[model samples]
Target: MKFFYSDQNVDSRDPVQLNLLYVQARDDILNGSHPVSFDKACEFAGYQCQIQFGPHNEQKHKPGFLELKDFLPKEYIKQKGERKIFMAHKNCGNMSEIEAKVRYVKLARSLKTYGVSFFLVKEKMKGKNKLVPRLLGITKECVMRVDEKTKEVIQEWSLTNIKRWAASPKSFTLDFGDYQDGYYSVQTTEGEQIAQLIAGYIDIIL
Candidate 1:
């Protein structure tokens, strides 16, 4: 089966069906059963594949990675939902280490209240390498709940270190490479397992 999105189409408008298409695309990328690349699959599914940023809103000279806020709608951002989801596709490219870390900080600060789900998809490899694109990692937005009486801190994944661990088959585990303390985390230590994690996360959430 294949997934395609048109400019003015409503073939499978059901939320469940649309989510199924997304999950199927994820599986295809993981299993290597599909002929297209992950980037292409996402494009066919009508996702915001690539985004560029510039000093001015009208300018489009430099191309940058996709952040959580970029994928969301204006209305969604305005309405404070109980829970929200943010999907980000990171491009593995050259950038000053300092710049990367700074940008990450901006992402963390832009998080919405309540809950958030962030998906990171690495950029395609360079040169003639034909490796399958894998899920970089997943991050959930958490707030620091404090009790004035008791001096205790409930630890949670910060946006900076959200790339550390993900859901495993049995339970939660550190299945990905270190994205924290760097400009952008493009390394994939647990490639296959990451694929499984992405599929599982999508299923569980939807």
Candidate 2:
């Protein structure tokens, strides 16, 4: 059966829960979520279906999700058949709204050109002027020096679009240029309103 909702279904608003739901659904199907009458084939096929939204939320006057709207560039889903999705809630384990917006901007910019996209990363230092605290994962730490001989940071940002040093062009780059004595900086933002409600609904549904 197909799935539909009041607010348009946006997955990114909450990545963690979306992921969990998909995983749980998949597990349920594999474990006989479909039919107890006995048949693996029927079980798999019966449960497989896609989810979408209604016309108003889909095409007409869809409300802008606070963090999501600003973070997501409208152009990404400008095409007629583009799969425009939304972010889930905090339970999904996505970065904070602050972090998601930053990442969203990075993702949106990357859609333009391979070599033209970049993200800023900032670290707040309290004690010594050398140590930096990074936020990449649930519990990971990265500290590097900011110097001229080795690599003086022109700007402080995260390399979001880059997959690895390999499989990417290195000749051209997008480095940060507004560096001051010690006020570190990274990149990204979104507003609030229905954005919060929509974001909240996403949390509830999945």
Candidate 3:
């Protein structure tokens, strides 16, 4: 339901799909559910605001029209980032819709989790009742087990190597490795969605 992939070798040529993925990431950015630096945050909002307001005008573009909540993440509300974003918006002189969108896409492309869909799940260890919180990162190119708090990728299974996968109401399972026999298991309420994402991407990219 959400993703992005850009490559010379892969087919990222469809603008509709490109904008669709950008919108998904926009939601991710606005919700503060994902990571982004404050400086980059302002620039992103600036470009988006330009797309909405056309060129910046001191009279037509009033504070009333610019809602900080819509333009910025939740943390920015407390950080008093509105003024900064407004300043940034003004700096984006005369950008057409495509102009801003292209810059927005470029800005997003630099992000760490740009094309990654994140799901939190419990990684069950081999021992009885031992589990750790993990981020199940599904992307256009790979499926990865990531640290929930840290940004570290714990392990990754490339798309070409993944041999099998299944999802039930309470759990998800996947198989991949040197010989496509390595196993991965996780407990999550979002099993179906995760399975759908994996299936959707493999079908599109592989």
Candidate 4:
């Protein structure tokens, strides 16, 4: 059997549907099955796969706590021909888009030293029991530099070429700063545009 993400193939981008795909992916990883199905599901659902503690360790962890520091630094990198997979869930409480983005940036900075790639998946809560896809924050690393004379943020280096540039060291601060602060109220058109842009690339992939 083959699977592909298509609007014709599924309806209602609901949390329950996303949960089932996550479950299937988790099962496949544990049983030595390829994560292609899971990968496609994530891509379809507009997310990237990231192993929380790497494949060398136990996959299960208690709810509400992720013990990332417990793993060795070597474990943070991907292994040859291994699937990079992790679990994701709906946010437990209400969070504005800006708040979520701020949280995502901080977490990404903390994990980037360990070489972990991170992304934020946004799900919207409409009513008491309804959850739907909204937006995604692709957390990326950038090096922060300041003008010696101006003391203002200057050139920012992305993860793409950060290593090549860092082979020999030059002194300048690196930061995960990009996001700004504001509430993303769904009631406003600007907020709606935010969601569209976030999911726009995912639409192309599908």
Candidate 5:
């Protein structure tokens, strides 16, 4: 019983699978979508630098020589700077291209959450009067609710537990708990798409 998605074939040189992870992870960092910290982001840059420009060398790789755009996110360039990241590239210890790419994937997997597809959903406040916007993250491993602003996980449920679900154009509902009395519901314009994606994720394991 595999709850988490397997990564048995993550190779950096193969642009099909590994490239997708890189693209997703980098965009998350660039747009402040995920909660990856500056320190980790800089280290990611180092691995990427080696992947793009070959193994780092003292003579070839200089402090000012790196274009931070190629490595770090543009929004973080001023706050974090590129000096330490340059050192990070050198610290890669002349690893081969495949090794650098694989290491980068390993580092990204350290994130609390990765490869999540977030959908904005309005939460009903426990039979109260108003709706508050929240994020619903769907991945192969689980379904989670997160704060819309902070990008932090609020609650998570394993995909293995999800027994039934239904969605309309305006709402998504799930019944994951074996004996739960209530159905968890949220309002979203993408409800149908969300429900379908969840089904697809589960179908692959079967």
Candidate 6:
């Protein structure tokens, strides 16, 4: 069970600040200094993560605590015959390869709510190129089409909130403490470490 976090609304590769934050965070956690970084401590614990940033790519030197509800897309889909789908999230451009995995999982979880099967794929466009995708129908949704003229602007599409997504059992729900605000990744050897960190961060209980 690999885990990752992102720089709020930004992806893994775009913002250099978030990448450094993850690194520093892992380091901070390992040193037990608790300066609000999710680097080596997270890595030592075995829970790798990534980050997503907010508006203006402001994920700079901050340690943690972030939310990207407004910047995320509000879209859903159910294909008639295909098992895979692709979407261009505005946040995808800033992620690194592994950090992008976190974003990939998050995206899959979001579309899953709308009965859409999705996953990250090899998108050679920009930023991280390691592609993947999520297959829909894993969890079906009640598709409802509203009249655009009658519906509120906010209700036009199924909006995605990172915190809300993290709360769901279907999503990555890892206990990342303040690290939840950005992206991260755990070394493969530290599965238990990662699990414990998640338990501790999200208070998942033993």
Predicted structure with the largest lDDT when compared to the true one: 5
Report per-prediction Cα RMSD to one decimal.
Answer: 20.3, 21.3, 6.6, 20.6, 5.5, 20.6
Which ten contiguous residues of candidate 5 have the minimum total lDDT?
Answer: 1-10
How many clashes in each structure? 0, 20, 0, 0, 0, 71
How does each model score on TM-score? 0.19, 0.16, 0.56, 0.19, 0.60, 0.18
- Candidate 4 per-residue lDDT over residues 1-206, each given as its tens digit: 11233443223335465445444443432332321232332221112122233222234533324332221122232331122222331321233333333332233222212121112222335564653322222223333223222223333344333221101121111122343232222222243333333333233232
**Residue 193 lDDT in model 4?**
38
Clashing pairs in 1: none
Output the worst ten-in-a-row residue range by lDDT, candidate 1.
81-90
Candidate 6 weakest lDDT stretch, 10 residues:
77-86
Angstrom error at residue 136, model 3: 2.7
Model 2: which ten-residue window has the lowest total lDDT? Answer: 135-144
Tens-place lDDT digits, model 5, residues 73-103: 6556776557778778889877987777777
> What would the TM-score be for candidate 5 when compared with the true structure?
0.60
Model 3: C-alpha RMSD to truth? 6.6
What overall lDDT goes with each candidate model? Answer: 0.32, 0.27, 0.73, 0.28, 0.76, 0.28
What alpha-carbon RMSD in Å does predicted model 2 have with respect to the real structure? 21.3
Colliding residue pairs in candidate 4? none
C-alpha-based local distance difference test score of model 3: 0.73
Q: What's the lDDT for candidate 4?
A: 0.28
For residues 1-206, write the lDDT of model 6, one tens digit per residue: 11243345445344565455445533432332221112211222222323333221335413223121211112211111111111122234444545554444333323212222222111122466553221111112111222222221121122111122132222232222453454222113333433343344333223
Give the per-residue lDDT digits (tens) of candidate 2, residues 1-206.
Answer: 11233222333446665445444443432342211112222222222211212112334323443232222222222322112332222212423433433332333222211111112223445665663422211001111223211123233233231222211121111222343233223221211221232233233232
Winner by TM-score: 5
Q: After best superposition, candidate 2 residue 37: deviation in angstroms?
A: 12
Instruction: Give the per-residue lDDT digits (tens) of candidate 3, residues 10-85.
Output: 2343667656756776778898556566777887888878877777788877666677788888766667666677
